[PDB]
Design an enzyme around this catalytic site. Structure first.
Site, PDB file in Angstrom:
ATOM      1  N   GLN B  99      36.062  37.216  29.953  1.00  0.00           N
ATOM      2  CA  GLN B  99      35.134  37.957  30.767  1.00  0.00           C
ATOM      3  C   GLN B  99      35.045  39.413  30.284  1.00  0.00           C
ATOM      4  O   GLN B  99      36.045  40.145  30.301  1.00  0.00           O
ATOM      5  CB  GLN B  99      35.541  37.909  32.252  1.00  0.00           C
ATOM      6  N   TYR B 176      31.376  46.335  40.403  1.00  0.00           N
ATOM      7  CA  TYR B 176      31.548  47.003  39.134  1.00  0.00           C
ATOM      8  C   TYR B 176      30.181  47.349  38.534  1.00  0.00           C
ATOM      9  O   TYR B 176      29.189  47.287  39.228  1.00  0.00           O
ATOM     10  CB  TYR B 176      32.475  46.215  38.214  1.00  0.00           C
ATOM     11  N   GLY B 317      40.860  30.163  41.123  1.00  0.00           N
ATOM     12  CA  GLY B 317      41.657  31.359  40.934  1.00  0.00           C
ATOM     13  C   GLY B 317      43.042  31.216  41.500  1.00  0.00           C
ATOM     14  O   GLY B 317      43.941  30.723  40.841  1.00  0.00           O
TER      15      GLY B 317
END
Ligand SMILES: Cc1cc2nc3c(=O)[nH]c(=O)nc-3n(C[C@H](O)[C@H](O)[C@H](O)COP(=O)(O)O)c2cc1C
Ligand SMILES: Cc1cc2nc3c(=O)[nH]c(=O)nc-3n(C[C@H](O)[C@H](O)[C@H](O)COP(=O)(O)O)c2cc1C
Ligand SMILES: O=Cc1ccc(O)cc1
Ligand SMILES: O=Cc1ccc(O)cc1
Lengths: 348, 348
Positions: B99, B176, B317
Site C-alpha cells: 500500500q 490521509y 486485519g
C-alpha cells in the site's frame, strides 16, 4: 490462573506453565544445520506466548538422526546456527530449551512427506531386532559403543549450554535409543544391560547422570519418557515410577511424560489428556515434578489438570502448529491479560 | 467454496479470496527501512494461507509518513529491504502487494504505544484546517507540491514493482492526503481542486491515472477509499459511486472499500460487516471489482458475503494479528483441504 503463574525449576523461573513440545520439522541442511525454517517457525511461537520452547529432537551423533534433515549437535560447527536460534527465541519472549536425541533402531527414515521409508543406515540398539517389517536390523551396542554415545550426549549438552539454551531435555521416549533400552519389547539382551529392570535402566540412568554432571544445577534437566509402551509384558507405569525415583535421585528436574513408539502394533487409547494419568502418578507418588503432554488443546483443560496436581508444566504440540498464538488466546479465556506485542495490541 | 477459489486480476491469479489488509507495524528504522520485525510478521501470515498480503502503508515521501518508523519507498536504498520482504512473502506462499501512502494532514505522529502525539512536522493538506484539536494546521498544497506528490506516488509505484510486488494499492482513505482531497470536510479549496465533486476528485484521479500508467496492465492496481466519512455534508456513498466510475474508466482494477477517518468526531455504526454494504453497492451498481473489509472474523461470514456478490476479495486485519493461521482453519471450516506446510501436516 495456574496456567499463567510463573514456575520455578532449577534456578530459573518460567513466566508461565505452557511449553512448546519438541516437534521434528525435518528442515535442517544435510549437515544438521539450523535453517531459515527454524528461525521463522520457533520465534513465531515465542511471540505466541509460551514460557518455554523445547526445540525438536537434535541428534547427538549422525546415526542418531531420524531423517537426513534433522537438527544435529554433534559438531562445533552447529554452534552458530543453534546460537542464533536460541537468541531469536529469547528475543521473542520465551526460554529456549532443546531436546537431545538418539534415534536408535528407528534411525534413518525419509521425511514423513517423502514417504518416510527406512534408508537402511547401519543403526544401533540394545538387541538385533528390527523395529518393524522392512527396517534394518540394529547393531547391538557393546559397552564401548554405549560410552561413545553417552559421551555424545555430554558434549551435546555442553554445546547446547554454549549456544545459550537454558533447559536440556534427554529424549528417552518413543522407541528411540534410550527408550528401547528400557522396554523389554525392544531390549532382550542377556548381559548386564537387559533382563532385570535395573539392568535395562542402567544405560539410560548413566546418560542422565553424565549429563546432570555438565549441566549446572540452576539449569533444569528434563527427561522425556514413554511411561508405558502399551505392550503386553512391556514397560508399564509401575516401571516408570521406579525409573522416576532413580532420576529424582540423580537430580533430574522434571519428567516429561509421553508414551508408545517402542513397537508399532499396539493399541493406544488416544483421548484428550490420555497421558495425563502418567504425569499425575509420578508427580503424586514419587514427588518428581512432571510435564503433561498429549491432546491438550484447550485453556480450561490445561488449567484443570494443573488445578488437579496432575503436572507442573503443560506441553503443547500439534495445537501450536495450527494455532501458534494459542497461549495469548488462552490467557484471555482464563481472565488473564495476555502478553501482546505492542504492534498487535489493537488485535486483542 | 468461493473463499478458496482463485481470483483473476488481469494477468494475475490470487489463489484464494483472502487478503491480509494493510496494517502499520511502526517498526521500521528511522530511515524507513524494512526490519527483522517485518521479516517475521509478514511471512507468518503467508504461511498462514492468505493468497495476497498487502504490506502496510508505505510513505512515498518522508513527510507523508504517519510515524518516524513507517516503511518508506522514497529511496533507492529502500529496495534491498523491500525486495527481501516480498521475497519472503512469496516464498511462504502469498502474492506480495504493497500500500503506497501519504498521511497528509495526519502525518507526523508518534507510535500509538508511545502516546501517538503530533511531532510538529510541516504536514501538507488541501486546505488549512487541522485534523483535530492538538493537531497542526496543514500547509495547503500548491500546484508544485501536488505534482511532486504525484511523481512520488509514480516512483514509489515503480520502485515497488522493482522490488517484486505484484499488487499496488493507492491509499486514498482514512483522512490521509488523497482522502482529505475528496471529502469537503477537509477540502475547502476554491481553485480547480476544491468545491464541486468534480474538483475534489481531481487530484486523486490524477494520481491514479499517473500510477496506472507505470504499472504493467497484467498487474492489478487497487485503490482504497473511505466510502463515506460518516459526517454531515461529507463524502457519501453516492460520491463514492461517482468516484468509482471514474477509477474504472482509468483502469483501476479493484476498489478496496473502507470508511471514516476524515475527522475524529463522527458516529460510526461499528458491527461485523458494517462496510460490506459499500463494497456491495460499488460492485453491483458500478461494475467495478471490490474488496470487503471491516470486522470480518469468521470463515462462514467470509464465504457468505462472497456468495451474495458483495465483494470479490475479502480483506482481513485484526483477526490476522491474533490468529495468523486463520486461513488454514477457514479452509477446513468450509469443507476444503487446507494448504498446510508439510512440516505442519500432522497438525491439521
Ligand atoms: C510432526 C511431529 C514431530 C514431533 N517431534 C517430536 C520430537 O521432536 N521429540 C519428541 O519427544 N516428540 C515429538 N513429537 C511428539 C510431540 O512432541 C507431542 O508429544 C505429541 O504430538 C502429543 O502432544 P500433542 O497432542 O499436543 O501434539 C512430534 C509430534 C509431531 C506431530
Ligand atoms: C494496527 C493497525 C494498522 C492499520 N494500518 C492501516 C494502514 O496501513 N492502511 C490502511 O488502509 N488501513 C490500516 N488499518 C485498518 C485495517 O487495514 C482494516 O481496514 C480495519 O482494521 C478493519 O479491518 P479488520 O476489522 O479486519 O481489522 C490498520 C488497522 C490496524 C488495527
Ligand atoms: O515426527 C514424528 C516424531 C514423533 C516423536 C518423536 O520423538 C520424533 C518425531
Ligand atoms: O495505525 C492505524 C492505521 C489505521 C488506518 C490507516 O489507514 C493507517 C494506520
Amino acid at each position: 490462573a495456574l496456567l499463567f503463574t510463573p514456575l520455578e525449576l532449577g534456578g530459573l523461573r518460567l513466566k508461565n506453565r505452557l511449553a512448546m513440545s519438541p516437534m521434528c520439522q525435518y528442515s535442517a541442511t544435510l549437515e544438521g544445520e539450523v535453517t531459515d525454517w527454524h528461525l521463522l517457525h520457533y520465534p513465531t511461537r515465542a511471540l505466541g506466548g509460551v514460557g518455554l520452547i523445547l526445540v525438536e529432537a537434535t541428534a547427538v551423533e549422525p546415526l542418531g538422526r531420524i531423517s537426513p534433515y534433522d537438527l544435529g549437535i554433534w559438531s562445533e560447527d552447529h554452534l552458530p546456527g543453534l546460537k542464533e536460534l536460541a537468541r531469536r527465541i529469547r528475543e521473542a519472549g520465551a526460554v529456549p530449551g532443546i531436546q537431545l536425541a538418539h534415534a536408535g533402531r528407528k534411525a534413518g527414515t525419509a521425511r514423513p512427506w517423502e514417504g518416510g521409508k527406512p534408508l537402511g543406515w547401519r543403526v544401533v540398539g540394545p538387541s538385533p531386532i528390527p523395529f518393524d517389517e522392512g527396517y534394518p536390523v540394529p547393531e547391538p551396542l557393546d559397552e564401548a559403543g554405549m560410552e561413545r554415545i553417552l559421551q555424545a550426549f555430554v558434549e551435546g549438552a555442553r554445546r547446547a549450554l554454549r549456544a545459550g539454551f537454558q533447559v536440556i531435555e534427554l529424549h528417552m521416549a518413543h522407541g528411540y535409543l534410550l527408550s528401547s533400552f528400557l522396554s523389554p519389547l525392544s531390549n532382550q539382551r542377556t548381559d548386564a544391560y537387559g533382563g532385570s529392570l535395573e539392568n535395562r535402566m542402567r544405560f539410560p540412568l548413566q546418560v542422565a547422570q553424565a549429563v546432570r554432571e555438565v549441566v549446572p544445577r540452576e539449569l533444569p534437566l528434563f527427561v522425556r519418557v514413554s511411561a508405558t509402551d502399551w505392550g503386553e509384558g512391556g514397560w508399564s507405569l509401575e516401571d516408570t515410577l521406579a525409573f522416576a525415583r532413580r532420576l529424582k535421585e540423580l537430580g533430574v528436574d522434571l519428567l516429561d511424560c509421553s508414551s508408545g513408539g517402542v513397537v508399532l502394533r499396539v493399541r493406544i487409547p488416544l483421548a484428550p489428556g490420555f497421558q495425563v494419568p502418567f504425569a499425575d502418578a509420578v508427580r503424586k507418588r514419587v514427588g518428581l515434578r512432571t510435564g503433561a503432554v498429549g491432546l491438550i488443546t484447550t485453556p480450561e483443560q490445561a488449567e484443570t489438570l494443573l488445578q488437579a496436581g496432575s503436572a507442573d508444566l503443560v506441553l503443547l504440540g500439534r495445537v501450536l502448529l495450527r494455532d501458534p498464538y494459542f497461549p495469548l488466546r488462552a490467557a484471555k479465556a482464563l481472565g488473564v491479560a495476555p502478553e501482546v506485542p505492542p504492534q498487535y495490541q489493537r488485535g486483542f
